[PDB]
RNA sequence: AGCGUGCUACUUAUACUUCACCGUGAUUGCUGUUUUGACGCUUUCACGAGUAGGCAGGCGUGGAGGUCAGUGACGAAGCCUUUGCUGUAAAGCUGGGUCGAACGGCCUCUAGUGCAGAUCUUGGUGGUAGUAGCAAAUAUUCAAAUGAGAACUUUGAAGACUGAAGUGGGGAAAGGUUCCAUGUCAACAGCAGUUGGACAUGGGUUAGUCGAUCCUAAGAGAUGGGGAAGCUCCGUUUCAACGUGC
RNA sequence: GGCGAAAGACUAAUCGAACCAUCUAGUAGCUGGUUCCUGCCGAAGUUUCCCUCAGGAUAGCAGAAGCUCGUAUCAGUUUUAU
RNA sequence: GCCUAGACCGAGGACUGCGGUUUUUACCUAGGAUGUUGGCAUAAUGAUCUUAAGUCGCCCGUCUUGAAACACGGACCAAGGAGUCUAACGUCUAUGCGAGUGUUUGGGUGUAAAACCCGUACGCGUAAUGAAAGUGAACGAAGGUGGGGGCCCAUUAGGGUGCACCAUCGACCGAUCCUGAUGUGUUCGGAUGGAUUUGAGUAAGAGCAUAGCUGUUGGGACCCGAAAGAUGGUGAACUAUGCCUG
RNA sequence: UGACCUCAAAUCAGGUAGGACUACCCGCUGAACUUAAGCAUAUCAAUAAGCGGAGGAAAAGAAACCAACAGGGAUUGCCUCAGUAGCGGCGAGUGAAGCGGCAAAAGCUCAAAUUUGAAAUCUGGCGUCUUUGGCGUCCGAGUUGUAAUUUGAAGAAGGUAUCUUUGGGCCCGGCUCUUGUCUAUGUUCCUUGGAACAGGACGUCACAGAGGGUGAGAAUCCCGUGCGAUGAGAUGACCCGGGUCUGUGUAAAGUUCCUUCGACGAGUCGAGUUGUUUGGGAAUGCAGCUCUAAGUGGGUGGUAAAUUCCAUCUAAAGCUAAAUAUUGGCGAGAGACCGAUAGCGAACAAGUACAGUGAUGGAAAGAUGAAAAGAACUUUGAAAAGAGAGUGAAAAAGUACGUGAAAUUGUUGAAAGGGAAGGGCUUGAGAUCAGACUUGGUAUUUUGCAUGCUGCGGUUUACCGGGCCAG
């Protein structure tokens, strides 16, 4: 049951796995029918675009801080800045997220500029709008028209400024300070009451 | 080549659709071409065979035989001509069953419904 | 292909290559890793030392995103410089104008100090550097800028 | 096969002591099935050994760059007359390869006109070869929708479709392909190199953009035409050269003389 | 023609020597004559047992891509055969006969791919073998008729037996047309068969009073209720506002 | 579970725990079988551990693929010396 | 040295060689059989099949130290009938690209399950080590010594350079142990220098992907084979026992 | 004599439930074989069987979330995370989630507020109309609370500057579905054949050379195919493009700022313990029992506890398409699938015949021919049959039907044979087969061809040379 110099395997096939085998023979058929659904939906609502405009947000965690991606909806503050009521905004292809807030200014400004770029190109029809004017429009892809773009990483040339303390020393000192913050605070405090009670 | 997704290239489906066709669907199957003379008299190239049409046999042992159709034996997928009979050693005669694809109609049995069918198919009847 | 297998060559020979005495059976020795401490001990000891037992402390709910910190050495640091401006940068660079290399935007966590640099000032931006890596960078007249 | 095929029985082995093999048997009585063996791959009505499953591997992955390597190699082979003749095409009455036709062929709309164009450019003998080579397939494949077999004719490669594809649709054996989408299943049928390809001038011009050159970059992202590991593909001409023959030793006999 | 011993000749192993051919391994040479095969040709030498097992090269079967503008109703495939040929072999090809609709070669792909065995599976057929046997229940015989045909059908005469706790005459359970007439003998009646509970075609079961139907028995079991996740369980007038009252 | 004047009796030719279907192709270190040809090479029943002793793992013996080299230094042998 | 009797074989296929006689740029017995004669071609010859004779030959498969066995299976024939597929892997081989590699989750496209095109991520790789906090690979031409194919210079030799790889001694990174500089939130820091210690490390990357044979593990797992166990149901027409009515 | 409350009755008026199907779905309940080379925890498996409940999908779902970041933002699925953190006689085994890329994207509703200058609300009866309903009226429900207003993203009541936006019904189209009808070109010639759909010649059409049929391989004989064209019937508050009539918009909704407020779900949260379950480890969820809250309170922050902060949501009420699943049903299209001992058990009057008391078990069985043309008639026979004849391309196709193997058997022929037979090797005999007078060359004569003597069989002895067997 255990022979030769081989890796030890974890093959989890001790249950009735043969009754739950899902083979995706319909991958091509699903692709084609997905395209047909997409075409029907696009043709139903033309020239109004198929996608709602989405914001741009920072990916969470220390691993994905660098990347920026498409969010769910513009916050109520971002819509407040461009003067669109959220109830109204949902009707003109702008997605809304009541849950997100803006602690920083960079994301808020980027999404405000995104909303302004969208609002500039928006043409809202009405009863007086006739079939010829509507016919003169093309159904765009909102996501491609307003793509989420990564901010440019720093490159080029800059002047060199060398601090006295090395970066390695800076990191070591920061680690040490964080490690001993609590014990140093406790020591300093108890010394404070010791020298403020016996010196009374 | 067939393009429609509603058309089947299956041999077994094609043969099942033929042998279990109803008598109404068998009427269209037993179509016969018209003679060269009628194909310009009516400007129609083929019609479902009928009881009182006159046909000329063009293929088989009975090629060249003429006569008026007697019955469209739809169950047997065949027609029986007036004098296309085979005699048994008994002395009785049995009709010879010819397929309508192996005859030409030399004279149509024309009434109100046939003429409308001829007009429908782009031809001239009257 | 089944035609190139030895099953096609074993046809006609009684045992199909499994021997007449041994008599290929269902599971002699057990199933899986059975008997690893009893009758398969001689195999586990020889080829998989350290297999049995506990070492170290548990870590409930370990999130691997915290420990994300890909390394880049100094011998590979100039690949992060744009390819078409590398030669121009390598020639005219000076303390008044040196190329800036943001290692974080390229997906790296720590700058390590293996290899030798071109004798060219650079401005390196990293979340972390090793002691030797930063000594080598300042030795060519560069600097390390810590970012977050 | 069906998952339960051969296993719709309640059979039990009779055990030993009843002078019959220990295979499971159908119980009950009154039918002739009673007492008959069951469930075995050796038994009539049992299930086959290792019944076939749908999660067998059906598709195979090929590296994209390798697939493009093969496409380029087949396109190159289409211009070698010995390979086209070995492939089996009647190209002896075509003066030179590749065969490039003016773009007026991209706009034909009737099969009669397209057939006349094929006749004019000398590629109709191969169409007639296709017509004549129609035979009934041998074996049970003719019960499964593969009733007739024939040869492969020329492949027509175009740049703009103005009806050439529908015009050549009904010509037997002739395949059409856009220059943008060329695949190995048309370029080397049966893994045998040397398809007979008729290019339009538009497709022939677009080839250099599709696969690039030393001056043109391929539209395919990051793609370059592959490099041969040998620079001169004629080795006899290389061997019988001044460079090589000025340093070799004199040759012995073609056949050693029997000295004993 | 025994025993001890010596000598001479002679006999013969797939052993040894020389030679031929096969294969394997090594080895010589081969492009200004390499020439349409260098995965080839060529020189020389040695070697050849073999289970379990390993590897290599091949033969064959179903299906797939390509090709032979392949074979075929003037006969495909299959099958039989001292018609032979080829290959060490797996096998391939062919002559003759039979037969009637498809099938092969070559380059590749693919697999439910090769049987003498498994008290193998299913089907079929033998020897045994015209053999064992067709022997309980006392017992049959003569004639006539019918019929192609009579030990066995019908009728007569006789002889018998069951011997009223019957081989009699009825029923309950169970069967289901076996009932009756006419016709009939392919199969069945372990011989036979003109006979039959067989086969085919028809016909036939009549109720106020005979039964069921009604009553209650051992019991079964709704309802109101009470359990139980629930399928359902308990209870039978039950902790009930219980008459489809007269 | 029943039933038993008790035999482990009987419970539909089934009883020291019925029958039917399913889980289920239950597991088997044990028995039986395991399908074409030729060519080349070719064993082991021994070591250690195992609730191990009809079984495994391990080393050994065998094949295959080769790779670095081209007589280097090697040998189931003798001699001399020790 | 000479004479002499018999048997078996005749591979090869222009010439080339070694010799000999030289009367000779000739010939020979000297790197493998030719000459001549007869007969036959309705046949001499060869092959196969059937059979006789002589001689040898036990019935195959199987487990086994040992089978013709008085060990087991096999009356006979046809057809079916047993190492398969998958997930994850190891070695090796082929192919593509190569510090990268992988299009095919998805989108675009289409002659529509194909073919063709696209790209973000992600996987594996490019860095290790420690339980962890953490730290994180050049003294030197990426080191020295002994070999080392090949190449260069020679002219046997010899000298130079020496990739892969082998032996060896070191250097670098992490862990462990020791030492403890300038300093300090006075308990932190950890420079420097070491240690019969340790790592699946560095020391000018080798991988990734696809395919194939083989081997492994889990799966019904080469095929057939239990005595058992569980879940849900069906039976008191037999039989056991009680009761009711005869 | 009357209301009210609670509880009844009625063949009261009008409704509703049950049962069936099984592939997927939501729950409950719940094993053991098996693996661990034994076995008890574990594993199989939070599976099979059992029970309850649905739909075209179901479920879930607009945070008492994930996190610890520069933060994301309902639910679901895929790829990945990851065979990882972890769990585990720390053995065998097992094992998620966050992030990221993508598919699809859609949001909301109540309770808790005095309408209080007017229960403004709703079922039913009756009447009527233009009827999935409207209008009127009368009872009834309801104040122990039916409407309007608000749902934490807020919002309310006042004040505020003005601005912005807008209801319904019918009629025809469109889009979706179903369905009707209509369409190119040889049956020209010759040969074989029973039959031409075969071979050959000459063709024709082709947005149709898919497939099927017809007496053999049929683009062109027929149906279809391809291309489309044109009718009809549906269907859609919850699709839009138009007309047309009503719009009761002193209405409603939103938008700015100010002030004051801002109700927010209890035997619930939470805690202990027990059991089960989970990767969840001083306890992941669920459930029982005991205890049992609060109002910046409460939950979460994966090691128990106290002290102090921070971050993040706002439970104990509710609805909601799509992306996802689908061995059932309905309808289609396909395949490197099987080809009648195979493939479903079933290609057939197959869940049939038949067995069993019952639950249940459960087969075998395709093919004459193009067409029955299925053998008239004569004769022998009691008949079945036979012999003639006849039909047929074929009776070497007669329903005991295409081909018709082997075992096994009959007849004929050959051969051998003292208690087996069979085999190898060798030769003999008999039978069969093969081969050089070669594609032999040399002059030769006549026989024979369309032809104006020319390729070349024919013959016999000469000559040369050969083959084979021998000396």
Curated annotation (Swiss-Prot), chain A:
<dbReference type="GO" id="GO:0009986">
    <property type="term" value="C:cell surface"/>
</dbReference>
<dbReference type="InterPro" id="IPR018256">
    <property type="entry name" value="Ribosomal_eL13_CS"/>
</dbReference>
<comment type="similarity">
    <text>Belongs to the eukaryotic ribosomal protein eL13 family.</text>
</comment>
<dbReference type="GO" id="GO:0003735">
    <property type="term" value="F:structural constituent of ribosome"/>
</dbReference>
<comment type="subunit">
    <text>Component of the large ribosomal subunit. Mature ribosomes consist of a small (40S) and a large (60S) subunit. The 40S subunit contains about 32 different proteins and 1 molecule of RNA (18S). The 60S subunit contains 45 different proteins and 3 molecules of RNA (25S, 5.8S and 5S).</text>
</comment>
<dbReference type="GO" id="GO:0006412">
    <property type="term" value="P:translation"/>
</dbReference>
<dbReference type="GO" id="GO:0022625">
    <property type="term" value="C:cytosolic large ribosomal subunit"/>
</dbReference>
<keyword id="KW-0689">Ribosomal protein</keyword>
<protein>
    <recommendedName>
        <fullName>Large ribosomal subunit protein eL13</fullName>
    </recommendedName>
</protein>
<dbReference type="GO" id="GO:0003723">
    <property type="term" value="F:RNA binding"/>
</dbReference>
<dbReference type="GO" id="GO:0030684">
    <property type="term" value="C:preribosome"/>
</dbReference>
<keyword id="KW-0963">Cytoplasm</keyword>
Swiss-Prot record, chain B:
<dbReference type="GO" id="GO:0042273">
    <property type="term" value="P:ribosomal large subunit biogenesis"/>
</dbReference>
<dbReference type="GO" id="GO:0022625">
    <property type="term" value="C:cytosolic large ribosomal subunit"/>
</dbReference>
<keyword id="KW-0687">Ribonucleoprotein</keyword>
<dbReference type="GO" id="GO:0030445">
    <property type="term" value="C:yeast-form cell wall"/>
</dbReference>
<dbReference type="InterPro" id="IPR005756">
    <property type="entry name" value="Ribosomal_uL24_euk/arc"/>
</dbReference>
<dbReference type="InterPro" id="IPR041988">
    <property type="entry name" value="Ribosomal_uL24_KOW"/>
</dbReference>
<dbReference type="InterPro" id="IPR005825">
    <property type="entry name" value="Ribosomal_uL24_CS"/>
</dbReference>
<dbReference type="GO" id="GO:0003723">
    <property type="term" value="F:RNA binding"/>
</dbReference>
<dbReference type="InterPro" id="IPR008991">
    <property type="entry name" value="Translation_prot_SH3-like_sf"/>
</dbReference>
<dbReference type="GO" id="GO:0030684">
    <property type="term" value="C:preribosome"/>
</dbReference>
<dbReference type="GO" id="GO:0002181">
    <property type="term" value="P:cytoplasmic translation"/>
</dbReference>
<dbReference type="GO" id="GO:0003735">
    <property type="term" value="F:structural constituent of ribosome"/>
</dbReference>
From Swiss-Prot, chain C:
<feature type="compositionally biased region" description="Basic residues">
    <location>
        <begin position="20"/>
        <end position="41"/>
    </location>
</feature>
<dbReference type="GO" id="GO:0022625">
    <property type="term" value="C:cytosolic large ribosomal subunit"/>
</dbReference>
<dbReference type="InterPro" id="IPR021131">
    <property type="entry name" value="Ribosomal_uL15/eL18"/>
</dbReference>
<dbReference type="InterPro" id="IPR030878">
    <property type="entry name" value="Ribosomal_uL15"/>
</dbReference>
<dbReference type="InterPro" id="IPR036227">
    <property type="entry name" value="Ribosomal_uL15/eL18_sf"/>
</dbReference>
<comment type="subunit">
    <text>Component of the large ribosomal subunit. Mature ribosomes consist of a small (40S) and a large (60S) subunit. The 40S subunit contains about 32 different proteins and 1 molecule of RNA (18S). The 60S subunit contains 45 different proteins and 3 molecules of RNA (25S, 5.8S and 5S).</text>
</comment>
<keyword id="KW-0687">Ribonucleoprotein</keyword>
<dbReference type="GO" id="GO:0006412">
    <property type="term" value="P:translation"/>
</dbReference>
<dbReference type="InterPro" id="IPR001196">
    <property type="entry name" value="Ribosomal_uL15_CS"/>
</dbReference>
<dbReference type="GO" id="GO:0005634">
    <property type="term" value="C:nucleus"/>
</dbReference>
<keyword id="KW-0963">Cytoplasm</keyword>
<feature type="compositionally biased region" description="Basic residues">
    <location>
        <begin position="1"/>
        <end position="12"/>
    </location>
</feature>
Curated annotation (Swiss-Prot), chain D:
<dbReference type="GO" id="GO:0003723">
    <property type="term" value="F:RNA binding"/>
</dbReference>
<dbReference type="GO" id="GO:0006412">
    <property type="term" value="P:translation"/>
</dbReference>
<dbReference type="GO" id="GO:0016020">
    <property type="term" value="C:membrane"/>
</dbReference>
<dbReference type="GO" id="GO:0022625">
    <property type="term" value="C:cytosolic large ribosomal subunit"/>
</dbReference>
<keyword id="KW-0963">Cytoplasm</keyword>
<keyword id="KW-0689">Ribosomal protein</keyword>
<comment type="similarity">
    <text>Belongs to the universal ribosomal protein uL4 family.</text>
</comment>
<protein>
    <recommendedName>
        <fullName>Large ribosomal subunit protein uL4</fullName>
    </recommendedName>
</protein>
<dbReference type="GO" id="GO:0009986">
    <property type="term" value="C:cell surface"/>
</dbReference>
<dbReference type="GO" id="GO:0003735">
    <property type="term" value="F:structural constituent of ribosome"/>
</dbReference>
<comment type="function">
    <text>Component of the ribosome, a large ribonucleoprotein complex responsible for the synthesis of proteins in the cell. The small ribosomal subunit (SSU) binds messenger RNAs (mRNAs) and translates the encoded message by selecting cognate aminoacyl-transfer RNA (tRNA) molecules. The large subunit (LSU) contains the ribosomal catalytic site termed the peptidyl transferase center (PTC), which catalyzes the formation of peptide bonds, thereby polymerizing the amino acids delivered by tRNAs into a polypeptide chain.</text>
</comment>
<keyword id="KW-0687">Ribonucleoprotein</keyword>
């Amino acid at each position: 049951a255990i022979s030769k110099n081989l890796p030890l395997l974890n093959n989890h096939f001790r249950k009735h796995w043969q009754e739950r085998v899902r083979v995706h023979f319909d991958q091509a058929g699903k692709k084609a029918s997905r395209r047909q659904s997409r075409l029907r939906k696009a043709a139903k609502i033309a020239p109004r675009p198929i996608d709602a405009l989405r914001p741009v947000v920072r990916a969470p965690t220390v691993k994905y801080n660098r990347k920026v991606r498409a969010g769910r909806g513009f916050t109520l503050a971002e819509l407040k800045a461009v003067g669109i009521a959220p109830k109204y905004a949902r009707t003109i292809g702008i997605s809304v997220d009541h849950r997100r807030q803006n602690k920083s200014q960079e994301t808020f400004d980027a999404n405000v500029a995104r909303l302004q770029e969208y609002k500039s190109k928006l043409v809202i029809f009405d009863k007086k709008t006739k079939a010829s004017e509507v016919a003169s429009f093309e159904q765009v892809d909102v996501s491609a028209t307003f793509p989420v773009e990564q901010p440019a990483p720093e490159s080029g040339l800059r002047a060199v400024e060398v601090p006295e303390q090395t970066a390695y020393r800076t990191l070591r000192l920061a680690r040490n300070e964080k490690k001993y913050k609590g014990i140093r605070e406790k020591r300093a405090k108890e010394k404070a009451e010791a020298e403020a009670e016996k010196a009374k | 080549a067939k393009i429609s997704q509603d058309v089947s290239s299956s041999r077994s489906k094609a043969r099942k659709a033929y042998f279990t066709a109803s008598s109404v669907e068998r009427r269209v199957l037993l179509s016969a071409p018209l003679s060269k003379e009628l194909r310009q008299q009516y400007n129609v190239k083929s019609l479902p065979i009928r009881q009182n049409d006159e046909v000329l046999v063009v293929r088989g042992s009975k090629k060249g035989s003429e006569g008026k159709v007697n019955s469209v034996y739809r169950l047997k997928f065949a027609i029986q001509v007036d004098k296309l009979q085979k005699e048994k050693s008994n002395g009785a005669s049995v009709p010879i069953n010819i397929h309508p694809s192996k005859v030409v109609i030399t004279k149509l049995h024309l009434d109100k419904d046939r003429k409308a069918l001829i007009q429908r198919k782009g031809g001239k009847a009257e | 292909p089944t035609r190139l297998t030895k099953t096609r060559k074993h046809r006609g020979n009684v045992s199909a290559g499994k021997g007449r005495i041994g008599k290929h059976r269902k599971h002699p020795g057990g199933r899986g890793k059975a008997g690893g401490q009893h009758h398969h001990r001689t195999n586990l000891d020889k080829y998989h030392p350290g297999y049995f037992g506990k070492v170290g402390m548990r870590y409930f709910h370990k999130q691997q995103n915290h420990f994300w910190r890909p390394e880049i050495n100094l011998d590979k640091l100039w690949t992060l410089v744009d390819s078409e401006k590398k030669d121009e940068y390598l020639s005219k660079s000076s303390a008044s104008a040196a190329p800036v290399i943001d290692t974080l935007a390229h997906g790296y966590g720590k700058v390590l100090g293996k290899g030798r640099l071109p004798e060219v000032p650079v401005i390196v931006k990293a979340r972390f550097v090793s002691k030797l890596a930063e000594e080598k960078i300042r030795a060519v007249g560069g600097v390390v800028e810590l970012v977050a | 096969v069906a998952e339960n095929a051969g296993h719709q029985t309640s059979a039990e082995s009779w055990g030993t002591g009843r002078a019959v093999a220990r295979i499971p048997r159908v119980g009950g009585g009154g039918t002739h099935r009673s007492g008959q063996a069951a469930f075995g791959n050796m038994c009539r009505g049992g299930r086959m050994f290792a019944p076939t499953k749908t999660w067998r591997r059906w598709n195979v992955k090929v590296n994209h760059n390798e697939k493009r390597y093969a496409t380029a190699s087949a396109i190159a082979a289409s211009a070698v007359t010995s390979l086209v003749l070995a492939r089996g095409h009647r190209v002896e009455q075509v003066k030179e390869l590749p065969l490039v036709v003016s773009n007026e062929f991209e706009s034909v709309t009737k099969t009669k006109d397209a057939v006349a164009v094929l006749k004019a450019v000398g590629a109709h003998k191969d169409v007639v070869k296709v017509i004549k080579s129609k035979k009934l397939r041998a074996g049970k494949g003719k019960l499964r929708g593969r009733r007739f077999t024939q040869r492969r004719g020329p492949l027509v490669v175009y740049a703009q479709d103005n009806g050439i594809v529908k015009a050549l649709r009904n010509v037997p054996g002739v395949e059409t392909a856009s220059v943008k989408h060329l695949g190995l299943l048309q370029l080397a049928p049966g893994a045998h190199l040397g398809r007979f390809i008729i290019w339009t001038q538009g497709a022939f011009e677009s080839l250099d953009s599709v696969y690039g050159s030393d001056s043109t970059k391929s539209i395919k992202s990051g793609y370059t035409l592959p490099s041969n590991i040998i620079s001169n593909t004629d080795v006899t001409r290389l061997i019988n050269s001044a460079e090589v023959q000025a340093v070799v030793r004199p040759a012995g006999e073609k056949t050693q003389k029997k000295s004993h």
